[PDB]
Amino acid sequence: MEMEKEFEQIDKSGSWAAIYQDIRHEASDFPSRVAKLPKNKNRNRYRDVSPFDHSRIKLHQEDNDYINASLIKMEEAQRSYILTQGPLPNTVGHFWEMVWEQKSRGVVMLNRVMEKGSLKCAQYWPQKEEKEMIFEDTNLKLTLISEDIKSYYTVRQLELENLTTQETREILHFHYTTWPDFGVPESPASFLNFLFKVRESGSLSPEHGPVVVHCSAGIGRSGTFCLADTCLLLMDKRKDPSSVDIKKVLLEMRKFRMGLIQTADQLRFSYLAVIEGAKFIM
Numbered sequence: 236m237e238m239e240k241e242f243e244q245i246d247k248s249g250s251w252a253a254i255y256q257d258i259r260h261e262a263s264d265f266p267s268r269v270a271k272l273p274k275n276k277n278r279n280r281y282r283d284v285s286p287f288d289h290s291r292i293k294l295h296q297e298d299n300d301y302i303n304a305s306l307i308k309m310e311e312a313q314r315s316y317i318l319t320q321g322p323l324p325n326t327v328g329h330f331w332e333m334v335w336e337q338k339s340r341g342v343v344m345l346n347r348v349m350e351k352g353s354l355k356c357a358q359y360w361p362q363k364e365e366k367e368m369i370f371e372d373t374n375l376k377l378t379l380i381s382e383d384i385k386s387y388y389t390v391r392q393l394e395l396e397n398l399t400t401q402e403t404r405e406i407l408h409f410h411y412t413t414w415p416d417f418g419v420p421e422s423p424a425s426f427l428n429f430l431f432k433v434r435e436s437g438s439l440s441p442e443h444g445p446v447v448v449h450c451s452a453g454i455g456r457s458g459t460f461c462l463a464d465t466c467l468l469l470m471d472k473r474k475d476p477s478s479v480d481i482k483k484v485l486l487e488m489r490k491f492r493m494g495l496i497q498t499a500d501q502l503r504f505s506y507l508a509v510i511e512g513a514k515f516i517m
């Protein structure tokens with residue numbers, strides 16, 4: 236079926252939970268043996284969210300190459316994303332090592348450091364120009380260059396330096412600051428505006444390594460971001476945009492990381508975002 240009318244048909248019939256459970260039943264299951272080794276317990280935020288072995292990002296380190304991160308490679312859309320968890324106190328250095336080694340231009344953050352009165356990820360970037368951060372385990376230096384605070388999101392320019400080679404690179408930090416503590420946003424308008432700002436920066440483009448995207452577990456909000464982006468790109472590329480099937484795209488992405496889209500409300504919100512974004516395109 237088309238998307239917008241499939242949408243109203245699920246709303247009128249109130250069957251979002253049944254649609255979402257079908258997705259969960261059909262989703263791929265692949266091994267995640269490296270993630271479950273005992274030496275990696277303090278590298279995982281949640282025991283039930285792990286990268287598959289076949290698609291995990293490897294650190295270029297011979298001691299321990301493990302990080303909770305997955306490469307999502309979308310062949311028809313010609314887009315790649317790295318989806319990861321919010322860094323932990325003992326993985327902030329690994330996180331920036333990955334950004335460096337994978338040649339990423341942008342980092343997309345969809346959570347606040349504290350939500351619901353608890354810490355959802357480490358404070359992994361510097362908050363003042365004159366107070367830079369040094370990650371001694373991976374030999375990197377990170378400096379805040381500039382910061383632009385808007386009503387729904389903040390963009391930061393950062394300088395990452397590889398202290399071994401003295402090479403430097405500019406990283407853009409796109410921070411969506413207004414996702415609610417419970418539920419999903421009422422309108423997708425500010426999320427779509429944010430997606431378009433990331434696109435405009437070049438961070439999603441083939442001349443760079445894959446964008447790094449995260450929330451707390453790296454599957455819920457993060458899944459919504461890449462699912463909406465890929466669906467809109469396919470609607471631009473194809474002769475028949477109504478052939479784009481969001482449930483099929485989601486199942487393809489779930490071949491690369493488990494659990495993408497965590498609730499039936501996130502699924503409905505993803506439909507809403509794609510439906511509204513397609514118009515604005517023309």
Ligand SMILES: NC(=S)Cn1cnc(Cl)c1Cl
Binds near residue numbers: 309312469478488
């Ligand atoms: N009809 C479409 S959108 C084909 N398809 C299904 N899943 C993905 Cl990804 C693609 Cl492409």
